[PDB]
Amino acid sequence: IPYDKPWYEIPLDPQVGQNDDVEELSKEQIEKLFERGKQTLEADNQTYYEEFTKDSSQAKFMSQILSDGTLNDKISAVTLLIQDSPLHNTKSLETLVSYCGKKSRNSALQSLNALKDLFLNGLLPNRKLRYFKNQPGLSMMLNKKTLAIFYFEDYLKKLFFRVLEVLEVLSHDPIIHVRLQILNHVFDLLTNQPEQEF
RNA sequence: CACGGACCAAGGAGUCUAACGUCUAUGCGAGUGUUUGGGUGUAAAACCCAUACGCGUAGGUUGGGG
Ligand SMILES: [Mg+2]
Numbered sequence: 001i002p003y004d005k006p007w008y009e010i011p012l013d014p015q016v017g018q019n020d021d022v023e024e025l026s027k028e029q030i031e032k033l034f035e036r037g038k039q040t041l042e043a044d045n046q047t048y049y050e051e052f053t054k055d056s057s058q059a060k061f062m063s064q065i066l067s068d069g070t071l072n073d074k075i076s077a078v079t080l081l082i083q084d085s086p087l088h089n090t091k092s093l094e095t096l097v098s099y100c101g102k103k104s105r106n107s108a109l110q111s112l113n114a115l116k117d118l119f120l121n122g123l124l125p126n127r128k129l130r131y132f133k134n135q136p137g138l139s140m141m142l143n144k145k146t147l148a149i150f151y152f153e154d155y156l157k158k159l160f161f162r163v164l165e166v167l168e169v170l171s172h173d174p175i176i177h178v179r180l181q182i183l184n185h186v187f188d189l190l191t192n193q194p195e196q197e198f
Numbered sequence: 199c200a201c202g203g204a205c206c207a208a209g210g211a212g213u214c215u216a217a218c219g220u221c222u223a224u225g226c227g228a229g230u231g232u233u234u235g236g237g238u239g240u241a242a243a244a245c246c247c248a249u250a251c252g253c254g255u256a257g258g259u260u261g262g263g264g
Pocket residue numbers: none
């Protein structure tokens with residue numbers, strides 16, 4: 001999967017675009033495609049990471065930050081790792097969501113602000129997110145590339161949902177400032193993106 | 199900047215007393231302390247007497263402040 005383009009704008013298979021009368025694939029057929037989509041995602045994206053590790057100056061300096069840096073520096077480094085290649089670096093996306101969940105209010109707010117900036121940079125579509133089972137033209141003849149893309153869309157929808165969970169728990173925080181900031185982030189997302197608007 | 203933080207009001211981790219001794223000030227001085235009692239008293243007082251016992255007593259030369 002190319003990294004130079006936002007992963008929604010990457011051209012899908014043509015078979016996605018003239019398949020509206022396709023028979024409903026059974027759950028096993030959807031499950032196998034969902035699995036095959038998964039293995040292709042944590043496939044070459046690793047090889048992309050292996051290519052990334054070849055640059056020793058780039059890997060070492062960032063690994064030092066990801067290991068020894070402060071929370072703000074780590075949040076930044078993780079945010080960039082997602083901007084450069086959001087599709088490939090599911091590990092950094094998971095890591096970012098993990099900072100949002102800690103007991104530390106200041107850092108969790110910073111991490112969630114970083115996620116909000118990532119979401120509201122156009123990374124999320126103009127349209128809503130689709131689950132893997134709800135993708136159009138879901139077929140056995142779909143290529144690995146498009147299949148990985150659909151799996152990543154399902155994964156990112158789950159990511160947004162767990163981010164909403166983190167918002168909900170934090171939105172009831174006793175501290176007034178935390179509640180106000182969470183409210184501001186919620187209304188920013190609601191105004192500027194369609195995902196989970198309800 | 200690095201690290202932590204429901205909210206307001208309060209409250210919030212033990213006592214009197216003894217024995218010996220150094221120094222200083224005051225009174226007296228081989229004395230010193232009374233009050234153990236009494237008198238007296240514009241009355242715990244203040245002023246005064248004894249009454250005992252306690253603790254005390256029982257040269258040579260050189261230098262030498264003066
Ligand atoms: Mg003599």
